Amino acid sequence: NMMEYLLQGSVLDHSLESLIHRLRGLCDNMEPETFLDHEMVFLLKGQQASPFVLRARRSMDRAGAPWHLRYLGQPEMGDKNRHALVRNCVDIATSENLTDFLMEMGFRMDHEFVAKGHLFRKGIMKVVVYKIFRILVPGLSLSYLVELSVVAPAGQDMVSDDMRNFAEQLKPLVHLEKID
């Protein structure tokens, strides 16, 4: 039923102020904040030959927040000049229940990654800046990521033009686009 319009964003590692101040100023929110979490992709597909990803992104800096998981894949060919995303389906989880259910039903951890950066929001949009590290479980590619994403029901792709205009607003700093 629901859908998504997640757009990919990649800025140089040194260009940080021109992004943080512009996003804090143009139109995001009042009183911004940050975050920290690590993702755990999984896959359980024996004969179907379609590994379904289950990102159990748990916020390590959160006070027992649920392991909000999302399923994304199979980008729909809409050709609406949008972020070229697919339908999304969020799913909350309990404390250590994601790993528990992954072990019960049977899953294979494809990889593990951690993220850390600042947070931003919008009206019907959402942009996030963070940095990915490559380290063991106890604790980088030198490239930040602007996570301009939209998650909403199908509707009529009205938010696509708004997201395109918002990206054109931040054109002097970055240049968002789709991905394969």
């Binding site: 998504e4 997640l6 929110n29 009042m30 904040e33 975050f35 979490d37 993702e39 990102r55 992104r57 916020s59 800096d61 959160r62 927040a65 649920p66 909000h68 998981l69 999302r70 999304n88 969020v90 909350i92 989880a93 309990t94 404390s95 993220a115 947070l119 929001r121 959402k126 994403s149 939209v150 998650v151």
Partner: protein
Amino acid sequence: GAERLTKSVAENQENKLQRDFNSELLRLRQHWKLRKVGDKILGDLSYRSAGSLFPHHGTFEVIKNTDLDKKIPEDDLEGSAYIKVSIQKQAPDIGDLGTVNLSPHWQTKLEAAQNVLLCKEIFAQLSREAVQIKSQIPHIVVKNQIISQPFPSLQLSISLCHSSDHLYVLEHNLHLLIREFHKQTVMPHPASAPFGHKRMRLSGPQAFDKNEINSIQSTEGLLEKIIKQAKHIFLRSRTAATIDSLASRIEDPQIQAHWSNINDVYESSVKVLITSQGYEQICKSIQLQLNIGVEQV
């Protein structure tokens, strides 16, 4: 020409008071709201920074003067106003005179505008709450004076004044509306795309049947102020009854009451002991009653 330009520049740099061009402007912007530069200025104190309000924004002052700010009229309350509350001798006749009884220039010229816009939002929210109020009490609606009646001997008249008990609940209502505004903005430490409230999704792990599903959000507006006024008159009546019983029972063991410091919004706490004259060992009866707002002690 060079000497004239140099003298003008040295004069503008020496006396930093007549520097209206971009200097007082930088000071004002560092002290006031944003300015969408369409022609000269825009973006008044419309409280759109909090969001979820009615459109009344617009440019207010962009002009040269002679310490030389514009402070031009706004687009056009331009007056001192404030909410008024009182409880005395309810009457059906309305339509009287709303008497109002009242160091840079822009600050005093625009703070009144911000305040009257806030009072306009107050009255609009009170209207939207009184049009769909419950059947617990009557609610008369007039142009400015919405007199109501929670229960007899308590007739509040929360009127909006303009230049065209009495103080506490005023500040409480203003802070309630600004708290509403702030809540209409909550950061859930999100990763993928929840974009909601923490307690809203907390029903997942801690599945509450009907407690949190109803406690996540509730009604507000006029009911809260009504409950507060009811609590106020109830506390006043209880205190008056205790004082009268003390003044009457003179030869009888004089009653000994003791209030509390923690007086919450709705409920409070009162303590009282009999404490007969000159006998501390005779304190055989000492009770502590709480005088809630929407109920009895």
